[PDB]
Amino acid sequence: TGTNSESDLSSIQDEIKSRLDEIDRVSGQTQFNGVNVLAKNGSMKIQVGA
Amino acid sequence: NDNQTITIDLKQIDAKTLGLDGFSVKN
């Protein structure tokens, strides 16, 4: 919006970059049984037969 | 695990670190 000044835009950008860094952190740190699920393209195979 | 942290920042706020050192309105 044009009403916002440059300092207000700076504050909004600071909050936005903080939340994007939060997203990146959640992506990197989340791990299940020694597997970083949301950190690399791959495929999981579940043996559901005899 | 190790190195799984969030960093918080602390800025020293006082008269010197704000330019309000010597603020006078009289001679």
Report CA-CA distances (Å) from B25 to A5, B7, B20, B22. 30, 41, 12, 10
Tokens of B9: 């920042």
Tokens of B12: 């020293």
DSSP tag of A8: H
Please, are residues A27 and A39 in contact by the beta-carbon 8 Å criterion? yes
Distance from CA of A38 to the nearest CA of B (A): 16
Enumerate the residues of chain B whose CB falls inside 8 A of the CB of residue A31. Answer: 1
Tell me which chain B residue has its CA closest to the CA of residue A31: B1
Alpha-carbon distance of A14 to B7, in angstroms, equals 15
Q: What is Dmax (Cα atoms) for chain B?
A: 61
Resolution (A): 3.2
Query: Which residue, among B6, B1, B16, has the nearest Cα to A31 in the 3D structure?
Result: B1
Alpha-carbon distance of A14 to A6, in angstroms, equals 12
